[PDB]
């Protein structure tokens, strides 16, 4: 497709906001296994970010953490609903309800790869890595962003589709902010910087039903 909008396909829920908690890398994985039930069960159910950040045990709480292992989570323990088990903020008590969801699996692409990287948006969302560590990727408002990026991938995010605007090439990019940042939470990064722009291409990742 020329073209890929999953937020007008019904399966992407509006944007959330992770406050000041490093847990980038829960909404990153939630946002990917919402839209992948949508497309795969035409159900939309959110999704608890909160049980990730209580309850995976690789990653580091408020301080960062893996998308990847968040998925392998999910597809060996399930993941329940963020109505029974809503995001407080923080990290608390890991708490096991009753689960709503799960996942078979998830894989990963090869680094650099934005050819296989659109592939696999055209089918779903993705989880990504950008650096974020800039005051130009902070303070993005609008356009196909063409400032500078941070020093290292440090902030999970999601492609939630692809486009073009003037001949430009852009991946639309879902961040955990809130809706003042970018284009009301979203970011057009330029599509086709080694590893990809902000190195959006480096360690991507999608779940499998």
Same mark, same amino acid.
């Given at each position: 497709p020329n073209s890929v909008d999953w937020r007008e396909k019904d399966v992407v829920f509006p944007i959330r906001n992770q406050g000041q908690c490093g847990s980038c890398?829960?909404?990153?994985?939630?946002?990917?296994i919402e839209t992948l039930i949508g497309i795969?069960?035409?159900?939309?159910?959110?999704?608890?970010?909160?049980?990730?950040?209580?309850?995976?045990?690789?990653?580091?709480?408020?301080k960062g953490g893996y998308y990847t292992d968040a998925f392998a989570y999910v597809a060996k323990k399930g993941l329940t609903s963020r109505e029974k088990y809503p995001y407080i903020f923080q990290q608390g008590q890991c708490y096991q309800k009753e689960k709503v969801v799960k996942i078979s699996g998830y894989r990963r692409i090869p680094k650099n790869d934005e050819k296989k990287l659109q592939s696999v948006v055209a089918q779903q969302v993705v989880s990504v890595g950008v650096k974020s560590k800039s005051r130009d990727?902070?303070?993005?408002?609008?356009?196909?962003?063409?400032?500078?990026?941070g020093?290292?991938?440090?902030?999970?995010?999601?492609?939630?589709?692809?486009?073009? &605007?003037? $001949?430009?090439?852009?991946?639309?990019?879902?961040? @955990?902010? /809130?809706?003042?940042?970018? &284009?009301? $939470?979203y970011?057009?990064?330029?599509?086709?910087? @080694?590893? /990809?722009?902000?190195?959006?291409?480096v360690q991507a990742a999608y779940p499998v039903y």
């Amino acid at each position: 497709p020329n073209s890929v909008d999953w937020r007008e396909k019904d399966v992407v829920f509006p944007i959330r906001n992770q406050g000041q908690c490093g847990s980038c890398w829960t909404f990153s994985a939630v946002a990917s296994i919402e839209t992948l039930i949508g497309i795969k069960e035409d159900r939309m159910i959110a999704l608890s970010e909160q049980e990730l950040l209580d309850c995976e045990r690789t990653s580091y709480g408020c301080k960062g953490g893996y998308y990847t292992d968040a998925f392998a989570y999910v597809a060996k323990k399930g993941l329940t609903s963020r109505e029974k088990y809503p995001y407080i903020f923080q990290q608390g008590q890991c708490y096991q309800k009753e689960k709503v969801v799960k996942i078979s699996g998830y894989r990963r692409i090869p680094k650099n790869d934005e050819k296989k990287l659109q592939s696999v948006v055209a089918q779903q969302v993705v989880s990504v890595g950008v650096k974020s560590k800039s005051r130009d990727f902070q303070h993005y408002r609008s356009g196909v962003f063409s400032g500078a990026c941070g020093p290292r991938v440090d902030h999970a995010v999601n492609i939630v589709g692809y486009g073009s &605007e003037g $001949g430009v090439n852009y991946w639309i990019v879902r961040n @955990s902010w /809130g809706t003042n940042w970018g &284009e009301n $939470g979203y970011m057009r990064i330029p599509r086709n910087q @080694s590893g /990809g722009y902000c190195g959006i291409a480096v360690q991507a990742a999608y779940p499998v039903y």
